[PDB]
RNA sequence: GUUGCGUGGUUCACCGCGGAGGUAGAGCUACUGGAUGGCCGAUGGGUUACUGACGUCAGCCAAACUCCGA
RNA sequence: UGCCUCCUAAAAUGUAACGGAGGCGCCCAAAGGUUCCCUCAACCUGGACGGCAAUCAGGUGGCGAGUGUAAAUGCACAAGGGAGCUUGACUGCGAGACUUACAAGUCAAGCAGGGACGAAAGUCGGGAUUAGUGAUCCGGCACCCCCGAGUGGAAGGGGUG
RNA sequence: UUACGGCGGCCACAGCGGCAGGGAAACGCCCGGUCCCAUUCCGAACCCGGAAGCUAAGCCUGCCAGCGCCGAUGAUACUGCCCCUCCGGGUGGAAAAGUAGGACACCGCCGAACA
């Protein structure tokens, strides 16, 4: 049922701190949505006891 | 021997008629006791016969008791008139028909096995015989 | 708790039907659209 | 597969209370994505007495969309039924929901002579 | 103990081949132990009465035992 | 016109065909629906889910979710049959594609101490499930306007017939495994 | 039971044909319970030599068990 | 000590005992009517809090779940689960039957009026069925205007609920 | 007459499962959600408009007894009526289970292609 049930869902714009920018349609956020980290910058996407004894002595 | 539960506490007497149709052959051991007449075998008599067999063989061998006393029998108190409700269960009974195999035995030595089964038979309120798995 | 109630025609006030209800589940007088033999049609009815 | 099974279930459920006889036959419809089919059954001996479908000259006698084609095939079945001597039927949804193509077919069959 | 209810006299009242009148009671029952066939109505308390004159006929209708009346 | 959908239709469909020797294009796996529910527990207690779950799942997804009611009663949870205990939404279509993109791209990485979703959480047929714990990474909700935090778990249903096929499809789609 | 007035084979017996059954018996991996011996052995028990779930292979029982059935 | 269900009860119906087991003296304004849609329990796997068991997803599952309330007979075609609209939980009847010492009790196609739901065909005179109840007398209340102790009224009686 | 799509009869000897094969029309998946209509959320479903793709699935054909189903003859249990004290016997019926075996259905009407 679609009369007054679902929230607004219209075109938005994602901008990231690194610069990877795309656009989909999200909810209530009116236009642009600014993000600090994305899939294009976050890590995991971009990659001795005796040793300590000897480096101490 | 007593069943853990019974759905119906007080029951009609089991009917004493017909030849047995199931459990009429030795199935677990080499020697068995076969009933030749109807009767109500009690858990008391079953334990007496089992103890007789075990104390005769004294060691080794295996004894199977392929009947269970699950049919109950009631009894009114001692000095009471007739008819004021059915009495409370006081015996547990197995319904034995002719041809039924009561006990089964495996033992190496023929004579000792047969003597043990005769010991058992003299405890039961039935005429019984000893049969073998051919 | 479930008394017998009687329904009267709105127009002619004839006591036409008697029935039961739960006074707690229905603390207010019923309205049903029953057939009135006097008026000859279906009319609204209400408790008395 | 699930669709086929569910439609069969709905058809049987409505079929419990609707038979169709010699004087008042049953009007079965079978609506696919592309076409529509109809026949009169007389469920006492399982004998179709008239039938029309969307594989005809109807396939090109197209004044628009599938609803218009259903209207046309309804006009055909009504006339074929009157020719066979029937004038009253019971409509069979076939497990579908009454509305759209099927309702258009049924209405056309109503104003073209069938009484149901 | 000691209580019981009245015997309700259920069962089949007209057997196969009997010629009945319209309105005959054929089967008193609880639930549909038998189901109604052609010319047989069920009844409020599952009574399977007759709608037409004819002869009673029992049969099987894909798992259900049914009662019918042939004109 | 969801970019993840066109990237799928453009490269993933024939990459999967190259990987598994599908003799028919109809056999190529795809994601059919995505299901998100909260699974609230405060049903017997405080009876509030009208905004704890509905008025934020609306924000995360874009459509109003459905309120689920207990099917039976359990005493050890004070649960009585017929009362609201869960809130579920079913994303499907381009909204589902857009939600998958918005998740994998900007939401999933934002999880604190995120080190990669497990690849062993498939059902055995090809369907993947994983859970969250808060009204975080979805930027749509604001922590300034939430009651108590609560998580969710997401089901990604695929037409894949085996776990390896489903895992390949999700890896191509951009799900970070480890 | 007898008797008056009506009716007249409608009654009953045998043969044939059309019907509904759940008794006797039997059977139970067909259900609800009971229950013997193996094997696997859940837990509980002190690495488990005690208990023995659920299963599974053979043998059995029941007025208020029935996939059956005179 | 009345009523309902089962066994005894001997395969039609019926059948006793201070024989063996249970329920009832209500509930529902929707848990009634109609139209449309759906299939459960249990088990397996995966999944934040979450565990044997809350919600989700996917498998397997033909009835082992459920049915307002005992049991029996039924019900998956659903009589089980959900939704929309409604008041037939009608008025005047009722051929023909079951049961039966009598009094009672039970079923009923179909006709008419005026309606509900349905596109129609059609279903609907409460509830899956069987308990939830009390003869006659004597009174109370509302309506019809039937009788009205010389006449007109009235009292009082009568009828229908 | 053959061989495909529907509507029924019948309700496992027909079911479940396994392995192969097919797309002329048709049945299907399929592509979309402007329109009637729809979701206790979702164009998934129901409905509407189409025809890019494909027999992968449904559907259809062939072969499999694996699970399930059916299943005699004979014998037995039981039993009506007699004889008979019982034990038993005569005469008339006759199971359930098990075995041999059967079985991967059959029939009718309509439409299309072929005729
Ligand atoms: Mg036996
Ligand atoms: Mg002795
Ligand atoms: Mg209310
Ligand atoms: Mg009774
Ligand atoms: Mg017979
Ligand atoms: Mg019985
Ligand atoms: Mg017996
Ligand atoms: Mg059993
Ligand atoms: Mg029996
Ligand atoms: Mg009886
Ligand atoms: Mg009887
Ligand atoms: Mg009898
Ligand atoms: Mg009492
Ligand atoms: Mg109801
Ligand atoms: Mg229902
Ligand atoms: Mg309703
Ligand atoms: Mg009433
Ligand atoms: Mg009458
Ligand atoms: Mg009328
Ligand atoms: Mg009526
Ligand atoms: Mg009633
Ligand atoms: Mg009831
Ligand atoms: Mg008196
Ligand atoms: Mg006067
Ligand atoms: Mg007066
Ligand atoms: Mg009257
Ligand atoms: Mg083709
Ligand atoms: Mg679609
Ligand atoms: Mg195919
Ligand atoms: Mg194929
Ligand atoms: Mg034979
Ligand atoms: Mg047999
Ligand atoms: Mg077969
Ligand atoms: Zn970034
Ligand atoms: Zn009125």
From Swiss-Prot, chain A:
Functional note: Binds the 23S rRNA.
Name this protein carries in UniProt: Large ribosomal subunit protein bL31
Annotated family: Belongs to the bacterial ribosomal protein bL31 family. Type A subfamily.
GO cellular component: ribonucleoprotein complex; ribosome
Keywords of this entry: Metal-binding, Ribonucleoprotein, Ribosomal protein, RNA-binding, rRNA-binding, Zinc
Residues that bind Zn(2+): 16, 18, 38, 41
Subunit structure as annotated in this protein's UniProt entry: Part of the 50S ribosomal subunit.
GO BP terms in the entry: translation
Keyword Isomerase: no
Originating gene: rpmE
From Swiss-Prot, chain B:
InterPro entries linked: Ribosomal_uL16 (IPR047873), Ribosomal_uL16_bact-type (IPR000114), Ribosomal_uL16_CS (IPR020798), Ribosomal_uL16_dom (IPR016180), Ribosomal_uL16_sf (IPR036920)
Ranges of compositional bias, category Basic residues: 1-16
Function text: Binds 23S rRNA and is also seen to make contacts with the A and possibly P site tRNAs.
tRNA-binding in keyword set: yes
Name of the protein described by the UniProt record: Large ribosomal subunit protein uL16
Record organism: Mycobacterium tuberculosis (strain ATCC 25618 / H37Rv)
PANTHER family: 50S/60S RIBOSOMAL PROTEIN L16, LARGE RIBOSOMAL SUBUNIT PROTEIN UL16M
Domain of life where this protein originates: Bacteria
CDD domains reported in the protein's UniProt record: Ribosomal_L16_L10e
Curated annotation (Swiss-Prot), chain E:
MF GO annotations: structural constituent of ribosome
A Gene Ontology cellular-component term: plasma membrane
An individual GO BP term: translation
Keywords of the record: Ribonucleoprotein, Ribosomal protein
Transmembrane segments: none
Family the UniProt entry places it in: Belongs to the bacterial ribosomal protein bL27 family.
Record protein name field: Large ribosomal subunit protein bL27
Higher taxonomy: Bacteria, Bacillati, Actinomycetota, Actinomycetes, Mycobacteriales
Designated gene of the protein: rpmA
Complete-protein stretch covered: 12 to 82 of 86
Curated annotation (Swiss-Prot), chain F:
GO molecular function, one term: RNA binding
Keyword line: Ribonucleoprotein, Ribosomal protein, RNA-binding, rRNA-binding, tRNA-binding
Gene Ontology biological process: translation
InterPro entries, alphabetized: Ribosomal_uL5, Ribosomal_uL5_bac-type, Ribosomal_uL5_C, Ribosomal_uL5_dom_sf, Ribosomal_uL5_N
Function noted in UniProt: This is one of the proteins that bind and probably mediate the attachment of the 5S RNA into the large ribosomal subunit, where it forms part of the central protuberance. In the 70S ribosome it contacts protein S13 of the 30S subunit (bridge B1b), connecting the 2 subunits; this bridge is implicated in subunit movement. Contacts the P site tRNA; the 5S rRNA and some of its associated proteins might help stabilize positioning of ribosome-bound tRNAs.
Assembly and oligomerization: Part of the 50S ribosomal subunit; part of the 5S rRNA/L5/L18/L25 subcomplex. Contacts the 5S rRNA and the P site tRNA. Forms a bridge to the 30S subunit in the 70S ribosome.
Family indicated by similarity: Belongs to the universal ribosomal protein uL5 family.
Name the record gives this protein: Large ribosomal subunit protein uL5
Record organism: Mycobacterium tuberculosis (strain ATCC 25618 / H37Rv)
Taxonomic lineage from the root: Bacteria, Bacillati, Actinomycetota, Actinomycetes, Mycobacteriales
Gene that this sequence comes from: rplE
